[PDB]
C-alpha cells in the first residue's frame, strides 16, 4: 500500500513541476534599440603603397542603421576606394589574372575573384608585370587585409539600450522589457543589476567569452537571448526577462568561407560630369536580438485530461 | 446513472469545442506591402533663430523604405542641418558644456549628452557666452523639439496594402490574404468591410485609440496583428485572417528613456573640394505585422490518444 | 487473446512513428548570405521617344543589399530619371489627367494615379496636347512598362550561398548548416548534392517551375524554405536540414493589385545650386529564407504520460 502513496507522490511531483494543468502559448515580440557613443578614429594606412591618414570622429549617425528585423549593426571597420569609373583597365596582380601574352586569358571570361569582364589584353600593370584588362570600374580595388589595428576599436565602449515589448495573443496579456519607476542609469551585470536592459559591447563579447579586438579586425555575429518564462495565474503571477549572450558567427577561419561579417558599400556622384562611385568594404559587428519565450495559464481542460491520462495509470499500479 | 450520461456529454463538448481531435501546426508567413499617398508640406520654422520656410511635396519616394523584417517605416518630421564638416567647434550652452574658464572642462571627456571630442578650451559662442569646444561635425545640430504643426501631418491620409502569404508546412495547404475575385477599392472597417486589406493609417489610429497629430509630432510605433485561425478539415474547412491594431509604444513621456521613434540620417557630399555631411533628425511611425496564427487537421493519434486518456476518468466517474 | 496483441501492436506503432516518447522543442535560426555574380549589362532603351543605350558591369555593391530580416534583394531591371526638381510641369497624358480647359480638373485635386499636387491650368504638354499641370517634382516620370529584354537577365547567372545556424534554448544543442570538412565548392541538385548551401538562382527557379526571365522582367517574391528535423536521443542522433523552394508571389496579373515586386529608390543631389533628384524605379525578385523546425528529446514525463493514457485504451480493449 505504500506504493500507493508513493506514486501519487510522484503524481503531485510531476504537476507542481511540469505544470501541467496550464495551457502553454507562444510569445509575440516586438524590439525597438538605441545604440549610443562617439569613437575618434586616428591612425595610418598604407593605400596602393603610398602612406595615409585616417582622422575624424564618429557619431551614431556614422557607424550604424536603424533597427530592421531585429537586428542592428555596429561598424568597426572600413577600407575606402575613391574615384571609380566605368572603363578599361588592368587587373589586381593574382596568380589567376596574371599573363605573360595575350593568349593568357580569354575575352569574356568571368572568374570567381575577380569583379570585371575580362576582354583579352595583356597589359602592363606597374614595373614590367603584365596582367589582362578587364571592362569594370577603375581603379580595381586593391586586395588588402583589414588594418591590424582596428580603426573603430573605441566602439568597445558603446552603449545600447534594448526595449521589448511582448504579447500572448491567446489570454490578455502584453507586457514590456522596463517597468515603471526603474532605474535607467545601469551597466548590465550578471549578478549586480540583470535587470536593467542597458549593454555594453565589450562586457557583452566578456561575458560571451571572445576579444572584441580580434572580432572587430574581421567583423562577426553576435546574439542576445532574452528569454520570457512567466507565469500569469493570479496566485503565483511573474513575468521577467533573462538575458543571455551568444556568438552565432561560424569561425570558418578559412578564406573559401568568407570569414567573419563583412559587405561592400557603394556611394555614387558626379565630377567634372562624369559619374563615378566610392567603394567602402565594411567590416563590423552584426547583433541579433533573438526573443523567445511562453507563457502558462490555468486551463481546466488541461488539468482534466492530465488527470485522466494518470488515473488509469495509478490504477494499474495499485493493480500490480 | 444520470451522471454516466453527464461526464459523457462533458466529454463531447470538451472534444467539440478544444478540438482534441485535430493536429496543430504553426504557420509561415510572408508579407509584401505598398504604401501610397503624396503630401505638400508648407510650414515655417525657426533654425538658429532665423525664420525659413519649409514647402514641397512629398511622393512614395521621398518619406519611406522598402519593406525588411516585417515592418515599414512612414516619415512624419524632421529637422535638417546643413553644411557640416569635422573640424573644431564651441558646443550648444548647456548646463554640462557651460564654462566660465579653460578649467571648467578636460581634453578627451566625453559626455552621453554631447557629440564631440572635448579639446578643453572654453570659448565665445554668442552674446558674451562660453563653451568650451569640442572637435566633430560643425555646427554642431541644435537641439530643439519637432516643429509644434506636423510636417507631414497629412500622411495621416496614406493607404497600405498589405498581402499576406501563409503556409502550413507540415499539411499540404498554403493560402494568400486576397482571395481572387475580391475588390480592390477598399477602407478598411471593423464591421462594414473586415477582410480587405486597404488600411488607412487615420483609421489605424482611431480604431487603436490615440490620435494621428500627438503621435506623429515625436514618432512611435503601432502593430498590425494578422490572426489565422484555419480549419482544414474537408467537412468544416475555413481558412481566413481577423485585423487588429496594437500600439507597440512604450509611452515613457521620460527625456531619459527616449521617448518615441526617431533616428538620425546621414547624407555625405563634396562642395569646393570640401567633404561636407547633411543630417537629418527624423521622426516617424513604425508599423510593424505580426502575422500569428495556427492551422488544425483530423489525426487519428491524437483522437486515439484523448479517447484513451479520457476512458479511465468517465471509468472512475461511474465507479465513484 | 489476439486483440490483446493487435493492440500492443498498435500502440508501439504509435509511440515509435509519432516520436510519442520525446519532448519536442521550436528552432531559433539565424541566417548570414553572400550573394556573387557579375553583370554586364548593354541594351538599348526609348526614352521620352529618343533612342539612348544603357551599357555597363554590375558588381555586388551595384545590384544588392545586404541581408536583413532573413531575406536578400536582387535587382533585375530599371527605369532611371534623372534631373527632376521642385517646381510645376503638366501631368503625363492620360485619360484621367487629360482637359481640354481650365475647368476639367480642380486646384488641389489628389488622384491615386498621379504623383503631384493638382493646380487646376490645363497647359500645353505636347504637339497641340493639354493637360493640368501639378507641383511636383519634374519632369513627371514616364509612364512605361519594363524593359522586353531584361537588363539584369544574366542575373540567373549569379551564386548565393547560406549559412544557418539554429539553437534549440531548452537543450543543451546548438549546431550550424554548413559541418566542417564539408566540400565549398558545389552548386546545389535535388539528387546529386543536396547538402551543399552554395544556390545557382536559375536552379532555383528551374526546380520551383517559373523561368526566370519572365519573372526578373517585372520581378517577383521567392522563398527557400529550410527544414530542420533533428533527432537529439543519443542512440540515434541526425540533425540535418532540407532545402526546397516555393514561390511567394501572389501572381496577380492585375493592375490594380500592383502584380510583381517593385519599388521606386531615390538619389539627392546638387547641380548648379540647386537641389535635384534621380529616381530609379527598381524591379528585382525578393528571396525569402523561411528557417523552420523542431527539435525532440527523451523525456520520461512525456513518456509516463503516453503510457497512462494508453493503459485505460487497451484496458477496455481487452474488456470489449
Ligand atoms: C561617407 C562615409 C560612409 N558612407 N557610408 N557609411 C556607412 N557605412 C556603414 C554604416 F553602418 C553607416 N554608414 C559611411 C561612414 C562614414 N563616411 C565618411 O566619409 C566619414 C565620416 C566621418 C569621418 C570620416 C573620417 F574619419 F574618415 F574622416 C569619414 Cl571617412
Ligand atoms: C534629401 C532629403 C532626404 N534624405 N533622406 N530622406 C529620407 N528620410 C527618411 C526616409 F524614410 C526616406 N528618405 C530624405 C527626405 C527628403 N529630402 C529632401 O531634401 C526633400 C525632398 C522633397 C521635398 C523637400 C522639401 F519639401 F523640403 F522641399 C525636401 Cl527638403
Ligand atoms: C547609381 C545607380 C543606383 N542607385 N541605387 N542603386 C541600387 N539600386 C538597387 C539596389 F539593390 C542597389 N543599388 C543603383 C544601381 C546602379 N547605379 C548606376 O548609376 C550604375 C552603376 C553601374 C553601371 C551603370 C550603367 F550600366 F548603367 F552604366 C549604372 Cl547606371
Ligand atoms: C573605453 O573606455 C575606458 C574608460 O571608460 C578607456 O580606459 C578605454 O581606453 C576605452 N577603450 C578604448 C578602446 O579606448
Ligand atoms: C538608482 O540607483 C542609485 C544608485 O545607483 C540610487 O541611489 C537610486 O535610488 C536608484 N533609483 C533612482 C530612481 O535613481
Ligand atoms: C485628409 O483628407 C481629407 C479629405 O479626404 C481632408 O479633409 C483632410 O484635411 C486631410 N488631412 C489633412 C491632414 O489635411
Ligand atoms: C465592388 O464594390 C462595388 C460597390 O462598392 C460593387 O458595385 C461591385 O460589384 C463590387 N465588386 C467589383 C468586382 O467591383
Ligand atoms: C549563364 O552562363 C552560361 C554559361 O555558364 C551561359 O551560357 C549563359 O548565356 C549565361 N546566361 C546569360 C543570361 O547570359
Ligand atoms: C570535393 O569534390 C571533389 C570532386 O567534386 C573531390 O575530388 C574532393 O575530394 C571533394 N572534397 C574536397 C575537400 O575537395
Same mark, same amino acid.
Given at each position: 500500500?505504500?506504493?500507493?502513496?508513493?506514486?501519487?507522490?510522484?503524481?503531485?511531483?510531476?504537476?507542481?513541476?511540469?505544470?501541467?494543468?496550464?495551457? &502553454? $502559448?507562444? /510569445?509575440?515580440?516586438?524590439?525597438?534599440?538605441?545604440?549610443?557613443? +562617439?569613437? #575618434? *578614429? !586616428?591612425?595610418?594606412?598604407?593605400?596602393?603603397?603610398?602612406?595615409?591618414?585616417?582622422?575624424?570622429?564618429?557619431?551614431?549617425?556614422?557607424?550604424?542603421?536603424?533597427?530592421?528585423?531585429?537586428?542592428?549593426?555596429?561598424?568597426?571597420?572600413?577600407?575606402?576606394?575613391?574615384?571609380?569609373?566605368?572603363?578599361?583597365?588592368?587587373?589586381?596582380?593574382?596568380?589567376?589574372?596574371?599573363?605573360?601574352?595575350?593568349?593568357?586569358?580569354?575575352?569574356?571570361?568571368?572568374?570567381?575573384?575577380?569583379?570585371?569582364?575580362?576582354?583579352?589584353?595583356?597589359?602592363?600593370? &606597374? $614595373?614590367? /608585370?603584365?596582367?589582362?584588362?578587364?571592362?569594370?570600374?577603375?581603379? +580595381?580595388? #586593391? *586586395? !588588402?587585409?583589414?588594418?591590424?589595428?582596428?580603426?573603430?576599436?573605441?566602439?568597445?565602449?558603446?552603449?545600447?539600450?534594448?526595449?521589448?515589448?511582448?504579447?500572448?495573443?491567446?489570454?490578455?496579456?502584453?507586457?514590456?522589457?522596463?517597468?515603471?519607476?526603474?532605474?535607467?542609469?545601469?551597466?548590465?551585470?550578471?549578478?549586480?543589476?540583470?535587470?536593467?536592459?542597458?549593454?555594453?559591447?565589450?562586457?557583452?563579447?566578456?561575458?560571451?567569452?571572445?576579444?572584441?579586438?580580434?572580432?572587430?579586425?574581421?567583423?562577426?555575429?553576435?546574439?542576445?537571448?532574452?528569454?520570457?518564462?512567466?507565469?500569469?495565474?493570479?496566485?503565483?503571477?511573474?513575468?521577467?526577462?533573462?538575458?543571455?549572450?551568444?556568438?552565432?558567427?561560424?569561425?570558418?577561419?578559412?578564406?573559401?568561407?568568407?570569414?567573419?561579417?563583412?559587405?561592400?558599400?557603394?556611394?555614387?556622384?558626379?565630377?567634372?560630369?562624369?559619374?563615378?562611385?566610392?567603394?567602402?568594404?565594411?567590416?563590423?559587428?552584426?547583433?541579433?536580438?533573438?526573443?523567445?519565450?511562453?507563457?502558462?495559464?490555468?486551463?481546466?481542460?488541461?488539468?482534466?485530461?492530465?488527470?485522466?491520462?494518470?488515473?488509469?495509470?495509478?490504477?494499474?499500479?495499485?493493480?500490480?
Amino acid at each position: 500500500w505504500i506504493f500507493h502513496a508513493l506514486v501519487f507522490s510522484y503524481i503531485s511531483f510531476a504537476l507542481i513541476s511540469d505544470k501541467r494543468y496550464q495551457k &502553454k $502559448e507562444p /510569445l509575440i515580440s516586438s524590439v525597438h534599440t538605441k545604440v549610443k557613443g +562617439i569613437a #575618434e *578614429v !586616428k591612425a595610418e594606412i598604407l593605400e596602393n603603397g603610398m602612406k595615409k591618414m585616417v582622422s575624424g570622429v564618429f557619431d551614431t549617425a556614422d557607424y550604424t542603421f536603424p533597427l530592421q528585423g531585429n537586428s542592428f549593426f555596429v561598424m568597426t571597420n572600413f577600407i575606402k576606394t575613391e574615384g571609380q569609373q566605368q572603363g578599361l583597365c588592368p587587373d589586381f596582380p593574382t596568380a589567376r589574372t596574371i599573363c605573360s601574352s595575350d593568349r593568357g586569358c580569354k575575352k569574356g571570361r568571368m572568374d570567381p575573384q575577380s569583379k570585371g569582364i575580362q576582354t583579352g589584353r595583356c597589359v602592363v600593370y &606597374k $614595373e614590367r /608585370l603584365k596582367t589582362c584588362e578587364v571592362s569594370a570600374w577603375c581603379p +580595381i580595388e #586593391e *586586395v !588588402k587585409d583589414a588594418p591590424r589595428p582596428a580603426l573603430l576599436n573605441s566602439a568597445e565602449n558603446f552603449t545600447v539600450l534594448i526595449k521589448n515589448n511582448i504579447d500572448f495573443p491567446g489570454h490578455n496579456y502584453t507586457t514590456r522589457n522596463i517597468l515603471p519607476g526603474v532605474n535607467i542609469t545601469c551597466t548590465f551585470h550578471k549578478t549586480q543589476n540583470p535587470q536593467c536592459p542597458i549593454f555594453r559591447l565589450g562586457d557583452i563579447f566578456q561575458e560571451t567569452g571572445d576579444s572584441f579586438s580580434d572580432v572587430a579586425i574581421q567583423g562577426g555575429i553576435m546574439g542576445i537571448e532574452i528569454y520570457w518564462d512567466c507565469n500569469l495565474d493570479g496566485w503565483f503571477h511573474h513575468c521577467r526577462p533573462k538575458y543571455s549572450f551568444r556568438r552565432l558567427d561560424d569561425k570558418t577561419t578559412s578564406e573559401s568561407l568568407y570569414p567573419g561579417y563583412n559587405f561592400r558599400y557603394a556611394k555614387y556622384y558626379k565630377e567634372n560630369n562624369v559619374e563615378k562611385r566610392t567603394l567602402i568594404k565594411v567590416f563590423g559587428i552584426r547583433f541579433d536580438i533573438l526573443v523567445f519565450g511562453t507563457g502558462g495559464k490555468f486551463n481546466v481542460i488541461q488539468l482534466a485530461v492530465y488527470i485522466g491520462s494518470v488515473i488509469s495509470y495509478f490504477g494499474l499500479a495499485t493493480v500490480f
